[PDB]
Design a protein around this ligand. Structure first.
Ligand SMILES: CN(C)C(=O)CCOc1ccccc1Oc1cccn2cc(C#N)cc12
Ligand SMILES: [Mg+2]
Lengths: 406, 550
């Protein structure tokens, strides 16, 4: 009932991001949604003297439409003041079970500082420039603004303090609109304690509409092929891959293996693995089991995720902050189902990686995505269920990172 | 008239004060025009005489480019006032308009003077008519001044609010708003459509906005933002391509401009060889000699512009369809239509976005551009009729390392068909000669050699002048292709050259890679393999010792 003064970082003007053209379906859903939000007083219509703008999209998260606002820019221009404005538990990655709750509707009770409201302005585009958009700004704490959990924290600690006293071994982490609740309980007990908390929140006026298992994640080790008859080409590939790996694990050796190729030989020639080359390859399989050494997480530095299309629904990914110092690696799979496509799977992978990243370190990684920029901006909202949006950019996958990470 | 609309509050940029640009001295004939205009404008309430304590000024001038007009120089005040929600930059596209039985075109005359300006901001509009002696007269504005940073937005918003009542009582009457124009359309009987125009005309006159009197005035065909709009069809205004002996950078720019413009309804327009000229450009003065390819292109454009073409308007019940046709050197063309020969619009796609590409990649990119365009114009994505078979595209998008969203489409069999002119092998070839290739160049003397060493025992080295390690690495592959049977394994150490070939290009900026492409088509099976350099694998170790050593 009383607002909290909010500042931009000093000497910094609000956002002027461009609204993306939307389909008539998505516009009609935004107008319906925004008409109701205007009746409930959460947003109001603004005049030409407000020059700011934040993009809006319509996603599905269900068969009713949600409205997702891209506060990525307003978050750069303020939330870091809210990243330092008045915390991440490292045990949440260790919990056997983790459940994600959407608590973003609690935000629509707290008024927003009337002097900051101009920065939340957004536009519902018209088709073909018939009209200028319908323009609104926010009166309440908007979802996706990183200052919303920052301001609501005090109320949310208050609501959760009962539950934390009772279940002292359960981990509760909040990131934006989500609570991450982790326990070591049996699955069935876990789902019960989740319902207990869900009911607790609903009892105090917190409308809440995902189960993860970080005890199964790891940093995927490199696997070398196991063949029955080797060709010159198989050894060349094997030697090439082990050569790449030796920038990472240092004790890998290739002398005895490339000795097998001495002289100019046809690529299809079958070479038998001598006893020495087998020992070198066996010793090299063993050094790939142990992990990397000096790969530590620097909280100040940015996390970067790289993704490789592998064929047949497989997608590999790496999270690192400095090249070759991989904090996590993994591979994703889609059950296809003759309704799958490259963009559905890329969009699903980005969300998995981002969730996984949030649990471990509490921040989203900046993605290098293997897709044409203009294709992403058109179709990403068709499978985006998450309420957050990571930073991203577009790249051309190198020719050998596909197979070495395969 | 003036208006009882509420005013938009307006601030200057924080920490800035009002403008104080002194008045340039004026010839007494112009001071006569200003005094009479200002007393008329004062008598209508649009401006007010002000006291002596107003510290701010803004220069004023008179002219009549052979009635008089007053013009004010708000450049300094514009710098000092806040930013506004940017006025409509884009314009509607003719192809996006829904067909209607009748369309009226209303000019709101003197529109900005018809809207009040925020009170506390009025002191910063003060201007001075010069006295003969020095004591000049001081006026300030009470309406939106013409030329101030905030007029187009505030008038735009005032107009939106003024319309809102009339629009709610008339859910039949479509009103596009664009600058100080209103375009009114309906499917009423022309008798009562003229009634509703008459209502709207007065509704605005009560809010103080005058509208054309002599009938509704402006009559078809409509000269609107470089278009021609008829009751049933639209087309662009007539293009004139200059005939010149020499061309400057500025002349070619104005020429791709006009050509780009015509390509939305004139199918077949090509502009790529012409914009290759501007690749360097530099000064708009620099004279850029044309190219045999640029000349052929310009010739072909004048040929297409010789006949007249038109587009039709939009019916939201009919489907939305696009076809794409190949045009040659990576140039493509498309039509979007609802009825099979009545085109809503056309357009071109000729971008490489890289040194080398191939047909399927380019077609997919064309389908992208159309999709982004249909969403902007009709709010939907079209059905695609395309000259490519599912096997061609399915193979391409599956082997492609980049993710891609192929729409639903039907094959239309209308050659030139889009095809993969070659596919490398995924497994090495048996009984085929294995060529170990390598190249080298000296990074200072720029001399070079490409060579190979095969397993049948063949060795060759070709000498090379004015090249780089990357160019020789490709010549090396090119050499192995030239000298091999119809099936060949090539093993390289070049990550650069591996990357370019594995991409399976079929057109290129460089003629070397165009040469390599011609080789690859003529071969039957080709497998390309990579090994790390300077690791003495065997085969590679001997080409390095042969070429790279010398
Ligand atoms: C002749 N024509 C365009 C049709 O028949 C299609 C129906 O378009 C309209 C529908 C409603 C309101 C106005 C319509 O016209 C315009 C729409 C957009 C821009 N404009 C600029 C002018 C001028 N000068 C007219 C229009
Ligand atoms: Mg070499």
């Amino acid at each position: 009932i009383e607002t909290v003064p909010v500042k931009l970082k000093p000497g910094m003007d609000g956002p002027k991001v461009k609204q993306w053209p939307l389909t008539e379906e998505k516009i009609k859903a935004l107008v319906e949604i925004c008409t109701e939000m205007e009746k409930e007083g959460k947003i109001s219509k603004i005049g030409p003297e407000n020059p700011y703008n934040t993009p809006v999209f319509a996603i599905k998260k269900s068969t009713k439409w949600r409205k997702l606002v891209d506060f990525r820019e307003l978050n750069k221009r303020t939330q870091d003041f809210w990243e330092v404005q008045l915390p991440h538990p490292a045990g949440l990655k260790k919990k056997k079970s983790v459940t994600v709750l959407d608590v973003g509707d609690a935000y629509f009770s707290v008024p927003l500082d009337e002097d900051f409201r101009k920065y939340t302005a957004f536009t519902i585009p018209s088709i073909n420039n018939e009209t200028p958009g319908i323009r609104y700004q926010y009166n309440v704490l908007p979802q996706g603004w990183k200052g919303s959990p920052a301001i609501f924290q005090s109320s949310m600690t208050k609501i959760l303090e009962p539950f934390k006293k009772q279940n002292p071994d359960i981990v509760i982490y909040q990131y934006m609109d989500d609570l991450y609740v982790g326990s070591d309980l049996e699955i069935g007990q876990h789902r019960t304690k989740i319902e207990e908390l869900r009911q607790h929140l609903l009892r105090w006026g917190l409308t809440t509409p995902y189960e993860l298992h970080p005890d199964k994640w790891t940093v995927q080790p490199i696997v070398l092929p196991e063949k029955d008859s080797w060709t010159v080409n198989d050894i060349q590939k094997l030697v090439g891959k082990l050569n790449w790996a030796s920038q990472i694990y240092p004790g890998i050796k290739v002398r005895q293996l490339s000795k097998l190729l001495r002289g100019t030989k046809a690529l299809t020639e079958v070479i038998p693995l001598t006893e020495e080359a087998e020992l070198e390859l066996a010793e090299n399989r063993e050094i790939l089991k142990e992990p990397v050494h000096g790969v530590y997480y620097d909280p100040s530095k940015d996390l970067i995720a790289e993704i490789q299309k592998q064929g047949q629904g497989q997608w590999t990914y790496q999270i690192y902050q400095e090249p070759f110092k991989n904090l996590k690696t993994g591979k994703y799979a889609r059950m296809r189902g003759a309704h799958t496509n490259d963009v559905k799977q890329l969009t699903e992978a980005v969300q998995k990686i981002t969730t996984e990243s949030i649990v471990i370190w509490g921040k989203t990684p900046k993605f290098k995505l293997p897709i044409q920029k203009e294709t992403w901006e058109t179709w990403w909202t068709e499978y985006w269920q998450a309420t957050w949006i990571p930073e991203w950019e577009f790249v051309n996958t190198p020719p050998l990172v596909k197979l070495w990470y395969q | 008239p003036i208006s009882p609309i509420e005013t938009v509050p307006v601030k200057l940029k924080p920490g800035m004060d009002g403008p104080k640009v002194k008045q340039w001295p004026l010839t007494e004939e112009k001071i006569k025009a200003l005094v009479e205009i200002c007393t008329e404008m004062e008598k209508e309430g649009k401006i007010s005489k002000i006291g002596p304590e107003n510290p701010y000024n803004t220069p004023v001038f008179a002219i009549k480019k052979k009635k008089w007009r007053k013009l004010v120089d708000f450049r300094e005040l514009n710098k000092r006032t806040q930013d506004f929600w940017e006025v409509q930059l884009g314009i509607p596209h003719p192809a996006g308009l829904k067909k209607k039985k009748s369309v009226t075109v209303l000019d709101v005359g003197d529109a900005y003077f018809s809207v009040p300006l925020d009170e506390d901001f009025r002191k910063y509009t003060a201007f001075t008519i010069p006295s003969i002696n020095n004591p000049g007269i001081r006026y300030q504005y009470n309406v939106l001044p013409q030329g101030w940073k905030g007029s187009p937005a505030i008038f735009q918003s005032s107009m939106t609010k003024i319309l809102e009542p009339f629009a709610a009582q008339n859910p039949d009457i479509v009103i596009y708003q664009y600058m100080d124009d209103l375009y009114v359309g309906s499917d009423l009987e022309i008798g009562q459509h003229r009634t509703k125009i008459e209502e709207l005309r007065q509704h605005l006159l009560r809010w103080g906005l005058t509208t054309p009197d002599k009938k509704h005035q402006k009559e078809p065909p409509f000269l609107w933002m470089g278009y021609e709009l008829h009751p049933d069809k639209w087309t662009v205004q007539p293009i004139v391509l200059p005939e010149k002996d020499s061309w400057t950078v500025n002349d070619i720019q104005k020429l791709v401009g006009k050509l780009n413009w015509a390509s939305q309804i004139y199918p077949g327009i090509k502009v790529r060889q012409l914009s290759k000229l501007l690749r360097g450009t530099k000064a708009l003065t620099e004279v850029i000699p044309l190219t045999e390819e640029a000349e052929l292109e310009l010739a072909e454009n004048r040929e297409i512009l010789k006949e007249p073409v038109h587009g039709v308007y939009y019916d939201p019940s009919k489907d939305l369809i696009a076809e794409i046709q190949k045009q040659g050197q990576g140039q493509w063309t498309y039509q979007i239509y609802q009825e099979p020969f009545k085109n809503l619009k056309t357009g071109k796609y000729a971008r490489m976005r890289g040194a080398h590409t191939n047909d399927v990649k380019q077609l997919t990119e064309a389908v992208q551009k159309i999709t982004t365009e249909s969403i902007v114009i009709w709010g939907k994505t079209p059905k695609f009729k395309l000259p490519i078979q599912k096997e061609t595209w399915e193979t391409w998008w599956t082997e492609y390392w980049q993710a891609t969203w192929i729409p639903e489409w039907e094959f239309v069999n209308t050659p030139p068909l889009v095809k993969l002119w070659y596919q490398l092998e995924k497994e090495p070839i048996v009984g085929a000669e294995t060529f170990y290739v390598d190249g080298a160049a000296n990074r200072e003397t720029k001399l070079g050699k490409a060579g190979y060493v095969t397993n049948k025992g063949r060795q060759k080295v070709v000498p090379l002048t004015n090249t780089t390690n990357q160019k020789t690495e490709l010549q090396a592959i090119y050499l192995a292709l030239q000298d091999s049977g119809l099936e060949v394994n090539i093993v390289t150490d070049s990550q650069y050259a591996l990357g370019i070939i594995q991409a399976q290009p079929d057109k290129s900026e460089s003629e070397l890679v165009n040469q390599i492409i011609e080789q690859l088509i003529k071969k039957e099976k080709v497998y390309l393999a990579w090994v790390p350099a300077h690791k003495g694998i065997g085969g590679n170790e001997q080409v390095d010792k042969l070429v790279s050593a010398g």
